[PDB]
Design a protein around this ligand. Structure first.
Ligand SMILES: O=C(O)CNC(=O)C(=O)O
Ligand SMILES: [Mg+2]
Ligand code: NI
Ligand SMILES: [Zn+2]
Length: 331
């Protein structure tokens, strides 16, 4: 078995190897990359997502989210308070202000220490889930707005034709902005490209150990657990690496820098934070190996997680028994 310790792998495709996305994902899995839950892909040196970022300040963040924490430093929830719209130019200025800017630090490790020590005492503002793309239409390789769609994969593998579309989202982050412990909708893959700015640190649990994280989460968030049998779908819970180590949960960590892709694999729980002002783009995708994960994915039926138009069809076709009760939560 390849990569038995489930380490995060880093790949350096040639420009030749960068032409066929599906084939490269299948290559990575042949080397065991999926066992980690997360992989880094460094694009060939000849490749670019676009010519410059010089004109992005006029993108609108229509609903910036202020991420308010409750709990203790290593075990907390966050709630998202909606703020008034602002442009990317306004947001970047806010991120760079004395109140919100990255503090002085020695290196990534010192900054990670400061994050876990101090996150709960601040409420950074996150521009999340903004439909759009920053890839130039002329970028032909690994353009996240030109991937084959999940609906087309399900059609190719299973023969069923369904409604729905699949488009990318932009994320504008600042120091301490946080993504809570989650897997993707329907335990899909995700791919994330860091277009610009400061790094993003990721934590990940190997898919084969995801249930260990869920069991810990039920112990640490016991009222949330009683309210919903898949409460990590709410994307509100944080657990520090110290806490994970104290409870024996297998995990890994890695820092993504501007110009790098990350791929998350089906049922790979992940969480993380941003080091300072940045802009990432991400989208879900599928392969044939995903299908069985999609059939087994947990669902939130309490009604909090409230998810896309396209997820309907996935649940309807892959999880017909659940369909009924899931859509009671969604309506
Ligand atoms: O970048 C972020 O804030 C969150 N992204 C993801 O969870 C992802 O790409 O799967
Ligand atoms: Mg603009
Ligand atoms: Ni994700
Ligand atoms: Zn729920």
């Amino acid at each position: 078995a390849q990569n038995p310790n489930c380490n995060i792998m880093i790949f350096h495709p040639t420009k030749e190897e960068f032409n066929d996305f599906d084939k490269y994902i299948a290559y990575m899995e042949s080397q065991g990359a999926h066992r980690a839950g997360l992989a880094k892909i460094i694009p060939p040196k000849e490749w670019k997502a676009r010519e410059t970022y010089d004109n992005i300040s006029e993108i609108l963040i229509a609903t910036p989210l202020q991420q308010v924490a409750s709990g203790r430093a290593g075990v907390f929830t966050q709630y998202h308070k909606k703020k008034k719209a602002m442009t990317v130019g306004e947001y970047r200025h806010l991120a760079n202000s004395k109140k919100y800017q990255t503090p002085p630090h020695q290196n990534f490790e010192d900054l990670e220490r400061k994050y876990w020590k101090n996150r709960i005492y601040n409420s950074p503002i996150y521009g999340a889930d903004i439909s759009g793309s920053l890839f130039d239409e002329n970028t032909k390789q690994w353009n996240l707005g030109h991937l084959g769609t999940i609906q087309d994969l399900l059609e190719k593998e299973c023969g069923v034709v369904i409604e729905g579309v699949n488009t990318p989202y932009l994320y504008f982050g600042m120091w301490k902005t946080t993504f809570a412990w989650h897997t993707e909708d329907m335990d899909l893959y995700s791919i994330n490209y860091l277009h610009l700015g400061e790094p993003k640190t990721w934590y990940v649990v190997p898919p084969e150990h995801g249930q260990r994280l869920e069991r810990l989460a039920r112990e640490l968030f016991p009222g949330s657990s009683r309210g919903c049998g898949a409460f990590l779908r709410h994307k509100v819970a944080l657990i520090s690496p110290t806490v994970l180590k104290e409870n024996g949960i297998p995990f890994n960590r890695i820092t993504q820098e501007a110009g790098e892709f990350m791929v998350t694999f089906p049922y790979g729980y992940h969480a993380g934070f941003n080091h300072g002002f940045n802009c990432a783009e991400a989208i879900n995708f599928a392969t044939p190996r995903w299908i069985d994960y999609g059939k087994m994915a947990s669902q939130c039926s309490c009604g909090e997680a409230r998810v896309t138009f396209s997820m309907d069809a996935f649940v309807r076709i892959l999880q017909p028994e659940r369909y009924d009760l899931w859509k009671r939560g969604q309506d």
